[PDB]
Ligand binder design. Structure first.
Ligand SMILES: CC(=O)N[C@@H]1[C@@H](O)[C@H](O)[C@@H](CO)O[C@H]1O
Ligand SMILES: CC(=O)N[C@@H]1[C@@H](O)[C@H](O)[C@@H](CO)O[C@H]1O
Ligand SMILES: *[C@@H]1O[C@H](CO)[C@@H](O)[C@H](O)[C@H]1NC(C)=O
Ligand SMILES: *[C@@H]1O[C@H](CO)[C@@H](O)[C@H](O)[C@H]1NC(C)=O
Ligand SMILES: *[C@@H]1O[C@H](CO)[C@@H](O)[C@H](O)[C@H]1NC(C)=O
Ligand SMILES: *[C@@H]1O[C@H](CO)[C@@H](O)[C@H](O)[C@H]1NC(C)=O
Ligand SMILES: *[C@@H]1O[C@H](CO)[C@@H](O)[C@H](O)[C@H]1NC(C)=O
Ligand SMILES: *[C@H]1O[C@H](CO)[C@@H](O)[C@H](O)[C@H]1NC(C)=O
Lengths: 434, 192, 5, 263, 214, 12
């Protein structure tokens, strides 16, 4: 009697299906098929064997073959199943930055996909399977917790669906979402090392160096270096989970005073910061003010500094002061540090050139070939230049021990001159026979 | 034999799953609720149907080949006395869309039955045919037609009254009715 | 005509 | 004159001045069912003047190329006014018809149309595998009808162009020589003689009344027995108009309306 | 009358009484009640659209030996059984259906005169039609635009049941084959509406043609 | 069991 072949078909969405209708009776008046679609009927033996091509099957349908025999209107049914992969497979949006040691949840969403009885959703860490579950609901969600380890680094996580139609005679159709990359970190709670001069002069250049280690991913960290309201441009150098940021800084007159140097290391929503002070300076030299730099013995002398009562040093100049030095010392506080600076200045006191018979005898009588030491010393401030010449060019060897010779004999004119005057004295050397 | 075909015999109308082949098939469901759906439907194929076959009319017909005549469908309401209602019984002859709603069935041969002291009401299917005889076997040529029932109003019960009940549907032939040409019945089987 | 055999 | 004729039914009147008599098919005029011959026991619906009147079909064009035309009764009137309604509301329907074919030319034209009315006009299907395999659309085209061809092109594998009539001219699509089609009620529109054909046809069947949604009792066929020719152009063209009136229409078995499968 | 007054051969049925494995379905044969098997009587009926007659059946049996199984069999008794529509149709050649309490049947003893009988105008209409320009049941709205197809024409509608024919003897050691011929004469005949004779070759039940002979 | 299973009571 009424028979159908195939009785179960699986085909892709939109395809044609071939359904053979058949019956068994003597006069089958009408063999026909159920369904409401466009249907090419071929022929084999008459109303006993027919073939229908039914075109464009979009959804599951079950066309039964009915056969009108007058004795028995019997009917037989075929089941058509169609197939389709998910229209979307993706992981719910998750922050890229993820805390080490804390739990994270992955959530895959699969929209569509049928037959659902053969669709599985799976969560993966790289190529490893973490979770597998039949697809249920719409969208079909599948979730799993993942304990963030350092092991989880550039680990890409993904979701995959498996529409396994192999048991129906087809194949396994897979789909995959965009991967998710875990960007973790860890930024210890300790200030970065900051090396910098506690002091810096106006209009000069300085060098700051900031560094820190034990952080990850160092390449992603933001390093903020700045002195006062001046943001610095550092040259970051990376290493074994570490960094060193070097930067130059120039200061001007406006920056004079105590300024704040800061280094901040930032990762995610956490930051470690170091605060230090740098003093920018200008220390005008404490100049020594002498009433009169050059003065004569006896004059009143006043000394004051210039760069609460005003103090000056008064003293009556004595010859012993010629060449002596007065000083003006000062101190300045910059960045809790004490800077010292001074200035000394000499005072010239005066006494005209002098040649007493006492310290420059008018005559000498030495035996030829004896040892003597010619004595003639000028006195005065400034120290007078002395020259004892004979015949305008032959000098008397004063102050030194010599062997008396014939050519020492003669008359010398000892001249002692200086800005205070000039004094002349005649010296006679007699050289007796040995 | 035709004398026996004029005797009112009970139709297995409600021979649905769990109701087939038990006394429950003769009992047509009725209730207080207002639907617009058919109470029953029936193809006028009177020997070769699922329901009408093992009636006395259907049986006698299936020892014969050809038939002619008007069919009497007599219905007995078996509710409580206190249950009122108006129904519509119809015979639509064939060749158009089958009467799924009441406005379709109302456009054919119909009767509005008022439930009352007269417990039984007949609806006659008049002999309307192209061919002078029809087949007892099921035909696409000598088509029979469609019998239905609808609610006109609803069945209405008052306080403390059974909200659901049944009717009994009988079939008999009319005195215009005749059969011809003998054959053995397809109903009975025997071990070889 | 065919027959049947 | 035999040539001059008027015909009036309902609110509709045909006139012709160059007919060649009129013919009554088999000698018998349309008649109703008689109480002695009646079969359905319901009181019949007789529409009279509402339905029994001239309905004019869309005119076809005779060319030198034209091979023939066919229509079916009551199919070609199923959409026609109040007749179509009475036909499709009832299960059973009976009717004879007055068939009036019109084709005027000039005294300088040649051509001869054989207008035949064939009872039960079952043509062969256009496929050598399946037998008598014709869809509801392809069997019942309505007002349009179908045309004849002089070629037999069977779609042996398929259910498109194999699911329709092989309307072969010389064999009437039926496998019988068209030269013997004169055993049916007929007239010839020979353009040098007449411009009209008038055939009155009774109800013919093996039954009293039948289901008009099943059965076409009559088929109208028009074949060019002599081809259309005009002296000047090698492509002449003349309109052929078919006007049909039913008569003695009666219907049994009222229900909801029959809407068959469609396009 | 006179034109139709001949017993013309319609179908030739094989049945084969054998004792071999797959020959139980050979021991009987079933035939459709039509008149399209042969062309000679058909073409003469096909002169008219409608006819009406009583029918004379005459049956001629001829048995023979198929292979070199030319050995001993006993005289064959055949049964021709008419099975009208909606009836118990057989399972094997021997069974309960073929008892025939109401199904009219003929018992032929081979060697006797050709068995014959008369049948009335049994038709469901007022005359027979050799045609039908219409459908069986109506194809309605939402079914298929292309519907009606298979259920057009006389072939779709004109069921009259079947003949079942058997040998009533059991299977013998040697296989015997029997051909039965069905002859028909329509008598008491009158016909309506002449039509042209069939000009070209027939194809089966319908009116249909072929490509290679028109 | 003589009788055939009906699909609905609203089967035509
Ligand atoms: C079962 C299913 O949906 N298969 C489709 C296939 O037909 C299509 O060619 C491809 C590209 O769109 O996507 C997938
Ligand atoms: C290998 C596999 O997945 N088999 C399943 C099967 O168990 C299930 O019953 C069927 C229908 O939904 O779909 C598929
Ligand atoms: C995911 O991570 C694994 C392990 O490092 C790697 O081998 C794999 O290719 C990655 N997948 C993608 C899409 O990058
Ligand atoms: C994340 O949390 C759940 C609940 O504490 C725990 O059971 C699970 O082991 C954790 N995942 C991993 C990989 O450690
Ligand atoms: C899923 O994979 C199929 C093939 O298996 C492909 O055609 C389709 O485009 C994919 N769908 C998505 C959403 O990627
Ligand atoms: C990371 O530290 C380990 C231990 O010293 C060493 O093997 C590796 O080269 C280091 N990478 C660096 C220096 O960035
Ligand atoms: C002044 O500073 C100098 C360094 O340049 C130092 O040598 C000297 O001792 C200071 N003089 C004083 C005591 O004011
Ligand atoms: C940090 O804070 C932001 C702002 O709410 C948040 O969106 C982000 O996920 C947090 N990340 C962590 C845990 O450092």
């Amino acid at each position: 009697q009424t028979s159908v072949s195939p009785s179960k078909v699986i085909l892709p969405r939109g395809g044609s299906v071939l359904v053979t209708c058949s019956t068994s009776c003597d006069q089958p008046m009408l063999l026909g098929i159920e369904t409401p679609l466009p249907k090419k009927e071929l022929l084999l033996p008459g109303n006993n064997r027919k073939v229908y091509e039914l075109s464009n099957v979009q959804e599951d349908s079950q066309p039964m073959c009915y056969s009108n025999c007058p004795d028995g209107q019997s009917t037989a049914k075929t089941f058509l199943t169609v197939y389709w992969t998910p229209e979307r497979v993706e992981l719910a949006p998750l922050p890229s930055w993820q805390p080490v040691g804390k739990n994270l949840t992955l959530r895959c969403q699969v929209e569509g996909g049928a037959p659902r009885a053969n669709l599985t959703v799976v969560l993966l860490r790289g190529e490893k399977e973490l979770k597998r579950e039949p697809a249920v609901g719409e969208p079909a969600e599948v979730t799993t917790t993942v304990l963030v380890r350092r092991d989880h680094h550039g680990a890409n996580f993904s979701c995959r669906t498996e529409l396994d139609l192999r048991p129906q005679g087809l194949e396994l159709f897979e789909n995959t979402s965009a991967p998710y990359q875990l960007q973790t970190f860890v930024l210890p709670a300790t200030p970065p090392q900051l090396v910098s001069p506690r002091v810096l002069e106006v209009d000069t250049q300085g060098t700051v160096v900031c560094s820190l280690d034990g952080l990850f991913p160092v390449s992603e960290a933001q390093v903020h270096l700045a002195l006062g309201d001046q943001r610095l441009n550092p040259t970051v150098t990376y290493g074994n989970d570490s960094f060193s940021a070097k930067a130059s800084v120039s200061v001007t007159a406006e920056d004079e005073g105590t300024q704040r140097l800061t280094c901040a290391v930032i990762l995610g929503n956490q930051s470690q910061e170091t605060l230090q002070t740098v003093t920018i300076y200008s220390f005008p030299a404490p100049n020594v003010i002498l009433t009169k730099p050059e003065v004569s013995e006896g004059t009143e002398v006043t000394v004051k500094c210039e760069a609460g009562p005003r103090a000056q040093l008064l003293l009556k100049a004595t010859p012993e002061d010629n060449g002596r030095s007065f000083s003006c010392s000062a101190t300045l506080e910059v960045a809790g540090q004490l800077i010292h600076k001074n200035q000394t200045r000499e005072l010239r006191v005066l006494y005209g050139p002098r040649l007493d018979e006492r310290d420059c005898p008018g005559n000498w009588t030495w035996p030829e070939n004896s040892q003597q030491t010619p004595m003639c010393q000028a006195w005065g401030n400034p120290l007078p230049e002395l020259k004892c010449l004979k015949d305008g060019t032959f000098p008397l060897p004063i102050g030194e021990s010599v062997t008396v010779t014939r050519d020492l004999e003669g008359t010398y004119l000892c001249r002692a001159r200086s800005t205070q005057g000039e004094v002349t004295r005649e010296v006679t050397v007699n050289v007796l026979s040995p | 034999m035709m004398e026996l075909a004029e005797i009112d015999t009970l139709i297995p109308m409600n021979a649905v799953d769990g109701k087939v082949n038990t006394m429950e098939m003769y009992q047509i469901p009725l209730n207080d609720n207002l639907s617009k759906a058919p109470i029953f439907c029936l193809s006028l194929s009177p020997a070769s149907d699922k329901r009408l076959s093992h009636t006395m009319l259907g049986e006698i017909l299936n020892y014969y080949t050809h038939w002619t005549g008007s069919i009497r469908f007599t219905f007995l309401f078996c509710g409580s006395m206190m249950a009122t209602g108006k129904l519509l019984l119809s015979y639509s002859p064939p060749g158009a869309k089958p009467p799924t709603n009441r406005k379709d069935a109302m456009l054919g041969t119909h009767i509005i039955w008022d439930l009352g002291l007269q417990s039984s009401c007949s609806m006659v299917a008049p002999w309307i045919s192209n061919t002078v005889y029809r087949r007892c076997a099921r035909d696409d040529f000598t088509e029979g037609g469609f019998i239905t029932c609808f609610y006109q109003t609803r069945i209405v019960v008052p306080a403390s009254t059974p909200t659901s009940m049944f009717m009994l549907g009988f079939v008999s032939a009319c005195p215009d009715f005749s059969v011809r040409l003998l054959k053995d019945t397809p109903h009975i089987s025997q071990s070889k | 005509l065919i027959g049947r055999t | 004159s035999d040539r001059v004729r008027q015909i009036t039914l309902g609110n509709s009147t045909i006139t012709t001045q160059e007919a060649a008599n009129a013919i009554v098919a088999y000698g018998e005029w349309p008649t109703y069912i008689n109480d002695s011959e009646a079969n359905p026991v319901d009181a019949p619906t007789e529409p009279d003047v509402s339905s029994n009147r001239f309905y004019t079909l869309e005119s076809v064009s005779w060319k030198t190329t034209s091979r023939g035309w066919w229509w079916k009764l009551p199919d070609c009137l199923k959409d026609m006014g109040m007749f179509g309604q009475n036909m499709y509301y009832h299960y059973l329907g009976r009717s004879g018809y007055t068939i009036h074919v019109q084709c005027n030319a000039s005294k300088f034209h040649q051509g001869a149309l054989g207008v035949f009315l064939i009872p039960e006009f079952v043509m062969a299907c256009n496929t050598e595998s399946k037998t008598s395999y014709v869809s509801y659309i392809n069997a019942n085209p309505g007002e349009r009808g179908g045309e004849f061809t002089n070629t037999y092109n069977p779609s042996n594998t398929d259910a498109s162009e194999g699911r329709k009539f092989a309307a072969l001219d010389y064999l009437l699509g039926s496998g019988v020589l068209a030269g013997n089609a004169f055993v049916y009620p007929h007239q010839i529109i020979n353009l040098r003689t007449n411009n009209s054909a008038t055939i009155v046809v009774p109800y013919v069947n093996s039954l009293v009344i039948d289901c008009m949604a099943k059965h076409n009792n009559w088929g109208i066929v028009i074949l060019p027995l002599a081809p259309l020719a005009f002296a000047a152009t090698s492509s002449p063209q003349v309109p052929i108009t078919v006007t049909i009136a039913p008569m003695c229409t009666e219907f049994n078995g009222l229900r909801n309306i029959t809407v068959p499968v469609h396009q | 009358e006179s034109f139709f007054g001949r017993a013309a051969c319609v179908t030739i049925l094989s049945l084969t009484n054998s004792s071999k494995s797959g020959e139980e379905k050979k021991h009987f044969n079933i035939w459709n009640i039509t008149y399209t098997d042969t062309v000679q009587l058909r073409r003469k009926l096909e002169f008219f659209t409608y006819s009406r007659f009583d029918l004379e059946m005459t049956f001629v049996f001829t048995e023979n030996y198929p292979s070199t199984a030319s050995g001993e069999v006993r005289n064959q008794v055949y049964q021709i059984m008419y099975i009208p529509p909606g009836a118990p149709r057989p399972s094997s050649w021997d069974d309960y259906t073929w008892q025939s309490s109401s199904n009219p049947s003929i018992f032929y003893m081979y060697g006797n005169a050709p068995p014959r009988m008369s049948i009335p105008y049994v038709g469901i209409a007022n005359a027979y039609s050799h045609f039908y320009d219409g459908f069986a049941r109506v194809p309605l709205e939402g079914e298929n635009t292309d519907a009606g197809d298979t259920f057009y024409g006389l072939v779709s509608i004109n069921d009259f049941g079947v003949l079942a024919v058997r040998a009533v003897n059991r299977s013998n050691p040697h296989t015997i084959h029997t051909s039965v011929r069905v002859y028909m004469k329509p008598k008491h005949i009158r016909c309506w509406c002449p039509r042209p004779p069939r000009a070209v070759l027939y194809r089966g039940e319908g009116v249909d043609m072929i490509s290679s002979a028109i | 069991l003589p009788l055939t299973k009906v699909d609905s009571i609203t089967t035509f």
